[PDB]
């Protein structure tokens, strides 16, 4: 029994490698040779929003792109107004430990969860001028690492027990569970169409999941260590990942194989976030050296460096308009660059 | 600015005033962290995530223990770690040593001091006085070690020494370990109190430029 299974798996893996190595006729860096480069860009910090008394672990821009959430380890969530640097709301959490945060696309709800395995949902626009809990979604086994809002009634969550789930908020129980990962799931990214989503774990492999059917579609493996962040090209046909090998990579969907790798000899620290620009040319990245870099996504040549913090950077976010970029840090201060 | 903007600025000021008070009240307590594998009795030292809370001489302590490389970055501002190990099993002592070595040489805990607690010394006494199981079977170097019934003292000194040896191999002098031989013992809070006081004292000496 076992012998046939092992032999069949090995034969299929070899078959898959042989098939995907028949398409790569030309690399990317050989096609975009005659392209005018970007040059040098310089961004000066335009604002700094202070008021937290501990480290910052999460952040998310509003659909309007004028407001934002931020969750700290002191047990409090603050909603800021970027233009006037004013605090619209202050929310105190039941559990001090928190590792994620999200802002609903309409603007009526926020959500958060952490080292207690529960994802709690808060409602913003009510009578009485209060901010009170609506639901407490439970049923996971390990901590939660990331959660993204789908509608005003659906969520997708990634836990630390090697599984992802799709919740319907009103009833309170899961409707779909995605399995097949062998390590903790650290990052989750949605698609602009909201019909597929990609996930990244600690066994150095990312996967492409379907939402309605509920079954894995493709698996990509090109890294040497665990993965800590993931994004999606604005077109919806490519995504960039970042790991503990101090290197980034750009995988493709239709061609099925990796395209390019971004790495420098001087940098050896792991990455903690990643993001694109509105057009898709720049690629931001945040390291543990207390600074961020900017990569030209079609040439792999550095273009600029932002260094306004003292401790490592936890989250990086870009607005829908693309007017500004906000980066969080452990020095309790998150700035806004333009 | 119009009238609405001044009213919104007033609201922001009040929010901030509340945040400051909450911060100071939070700043008046001392937090810890508890670690122990199994068959060690972590819950019987002071007799998703559980937590306790105690006090001694008008100081407030908080404990945290879950039921591990990835969530350990959250606890890098606590004052001290607690590590509870068993002392009657000879089969798994190597596993406890490897676990201690992995915690001591981590990357985010490079300045957090450890407290040890070697449990169940009376079971060690009975198991070594019976003579059925010998330490020389599992540890070869025990035959030559001589102490600096005398048998119980020799054995327990050997077991304590190997942990302290793991501790002093490469620490750089920024943090240290504080062994203990805990039995039904009822004075487990005074010891933690004294060791935390000493930890903060070394910190204050380091800040005032004397060292």
């Amino acid at each position, epitope marked *: 029994e076992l012998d046939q299974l092992r032999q069949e798996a090995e034969q299929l893996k070899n078959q898959i490698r042989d098939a995907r190595k028949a398409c790569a006729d030309a690399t990317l860096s050989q096609i975009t040779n005659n392209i005018d480069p970007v040059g040098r860009i310089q961004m000066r910090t335009r604002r700094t929003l202070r008021g937290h008394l501990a480290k910052i672990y999460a952040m998310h821009w509003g659909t309007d792109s004028r*407001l934002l959430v931020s969750a700290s380890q002191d047990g409090k969530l603050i909603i800021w*107004d970027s233009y*006037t640097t*004013n605090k*619209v*709301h202050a929310i105190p959490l039941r559990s001090s430990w928190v590792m994620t945060c999200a802002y609903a696309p309409s603007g009526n709800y926020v959500a958060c969860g952490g080292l207690d395995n529960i994802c709690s949902i808060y409602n913003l626009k009510t*009578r*009485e*001028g*209060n901010v009170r809990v609506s639901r407490e979604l439970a049923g996971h086994t390990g901590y939660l690492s990331c959660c993204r809002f789908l509608d005003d009634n659906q969520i997708v969550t990634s836990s630390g027990d090697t599984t992802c789930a799709l919740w319907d908020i009103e009833t309170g129980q899961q409707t779909t569970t995605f399995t097949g990962h062998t390590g903790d799931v650290m990052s989750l990214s949605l698609a602009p169409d909201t019909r597929l989503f990609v996930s990244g774990a600690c066994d150095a492999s990312a996967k492409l999941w379907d939402v309605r059917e509920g079954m894995c579609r493709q698996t990509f493996t090109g890294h040497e260590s665990d993965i800590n962040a993931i994004c999606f090209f604005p077109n919806g046909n490519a995504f960039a990942t970042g790991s503990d090998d101090a290197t980034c990579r750009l995988f493709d969907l239709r061609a099925d194989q990796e395209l390019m790798t971004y790495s420098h000899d001087n940098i050896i620290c792991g990455i903690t976030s990643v993001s694109f620009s509105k057009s898709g040319r720049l690629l931001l990245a945040g390291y543990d050296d207390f600074n961020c870099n900017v990569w030209d996504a079609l040439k792999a040549d550095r273009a600029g460096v932002l260094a306004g913090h003292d401790n490592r950077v936890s989250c990086l976010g870009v607005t829908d308009d693309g007017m500004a970029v906000a980066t969080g840090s452990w020095d309790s201060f998150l700035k806004i660059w333009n | 600015v*119009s*009238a*609405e903007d001044k*009213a*919104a600025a*007033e*609201r922001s000021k*009040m929010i901030d005033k509340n945040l400051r008070e909450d911060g100071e009240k939070a700043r008046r307590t001392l937090r810890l962290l508890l670690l122990g594998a199994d068959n060690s009795g972590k819950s019987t030292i002071v007799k998703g995530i559980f937590e306790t809370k105690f006090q001694v001489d008008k100081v407030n302590f908080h404990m945290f223990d879950v039921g591990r490389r990835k969530w350990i970055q959250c606890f890098n501002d606590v004052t001290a770690i607690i590590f509870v190990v068993d002392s009657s099993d000879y089969n798994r002592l190597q596993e406890a040593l490897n676990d201690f070595k992995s915690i001591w040489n981590n990357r985010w805990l490079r300045t957090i001091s450890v407290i040890l607690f070697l449990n169940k010394q009376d079971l060690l006494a009975e198991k070594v006085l019976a003579g059925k199981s010998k330490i020389e079977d599992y540890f070869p170097e025990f035959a030559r070690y001589t102490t600096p019934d005398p048998r119980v003292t020799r054995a327990k000194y050997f077991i304590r020494k190997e942990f302290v040896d793991i501790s002093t191999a490469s620490g750089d002098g920024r943090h240290i370990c504080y062994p203990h031989f805990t039995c039904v013992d009822t004075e487990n809070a005074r010891r933690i109190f004294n060791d935390c006081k000493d930890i903060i004292l070394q910190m204050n000496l380091r800040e005032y430029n004397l060292v």
Partner: single-chain antibody, 230 residues
Framework: VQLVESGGGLVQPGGSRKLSCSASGFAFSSFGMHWVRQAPEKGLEWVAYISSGSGTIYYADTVKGRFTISRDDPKNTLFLQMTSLRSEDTAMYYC??????????????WGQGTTLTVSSDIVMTQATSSVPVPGESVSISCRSSKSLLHSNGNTYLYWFLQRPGQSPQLLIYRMSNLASGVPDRFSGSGSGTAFTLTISRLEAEDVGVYYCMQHLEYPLTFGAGTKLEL
């Protein structure tokens, strides 16, 4: 939410009276109270405003120096103290609550009024007083003394509709947005110094008086008002 006002009655001239309002079902501390009085043959006129936490106090020129406003957070009550009364103070006083933050809507709830009978400025005027009109669209226009459009791009104009023998309710805030619990048929359009309110598919119980109020700067001044009849 419930707002209740206790006080009023016949008072001799030069007498001192106290009006107490108690609010329940919402957080009193966050909101900032307002005082509005309506004359028997005249439109609503602003009287006094108290900021949340008692940080800022503003008074009308007419009642300045003889009226004191105070509030107690624990008792959840609002008090107005009047001294040295005159003959032209016979009116009805309504308790109003407003909260200020980005995207918030002020003057959402109006408390029940009481009766008290004794024994420069932006000028906003509406040309139409009475309009005769179901199933036919109606248009109401309110003129302004000066442009209400600020540097930020926000124009402050408020439309209030009062049914016969009932407290007025907010319909449109900032001349575009629609208040919660209000039907979609009502619409608001505007330009600097000219504002028009258009209602379509008019039905029964929509008859009432409409007032345009500018919140650009203190003191707030209400419009003359327009009366709708079948």
């Amino acid at each position: 939410v419930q707002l209740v006002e206790s006080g009023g009655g016949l008072v001799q001239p030069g007498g001192s009276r106290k009006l107490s309002c108690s609010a329940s079902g919402f957080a009193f501390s966050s909101f900032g109270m307002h005082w509005v009085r309506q004359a028997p043959e005249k439109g609503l006129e602003w009287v006094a405003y108290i900021s949340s936490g008692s940080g800022t106090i503003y008074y009308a020129d007419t009642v300045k120096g003889r009226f004191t406003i105070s509030r107690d957070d624990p008792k959840n009550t609002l008090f107005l103290q009047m001294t040295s009364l005159r003959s032209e103070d016979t009116a009805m006083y309504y308790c109003v609550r407003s909260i200020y933050y980005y995207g918030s809507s002020p003057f959402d709830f109006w408390g029940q009024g009481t009766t008290l009978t004794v024994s420069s400025d932006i000028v906003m005027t509406q040309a139409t007083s009475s309009v005769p009109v179901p199933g036919e669209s109606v248009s109401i226009s309110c003129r302004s003394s000066k442009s209400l459009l600020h540097s930020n791009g926000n124009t402050y104009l408020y439309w209030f509709l009062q049914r016969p023998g009932q407290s007025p309710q907010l319909l449109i805030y900032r001349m575009s947005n629609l208040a919660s619990g209000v039907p979609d048929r009502f619409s608001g359009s505007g330009s600097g110094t000219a504002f028009t309110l258009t209602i379509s598919r008019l039905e029964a119980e929509d008859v009432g008086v409409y007032y345009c109020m500018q919140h650009l700067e203190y003191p707030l001044t209400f419009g003359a008002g327009t009366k709708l009849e079948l």
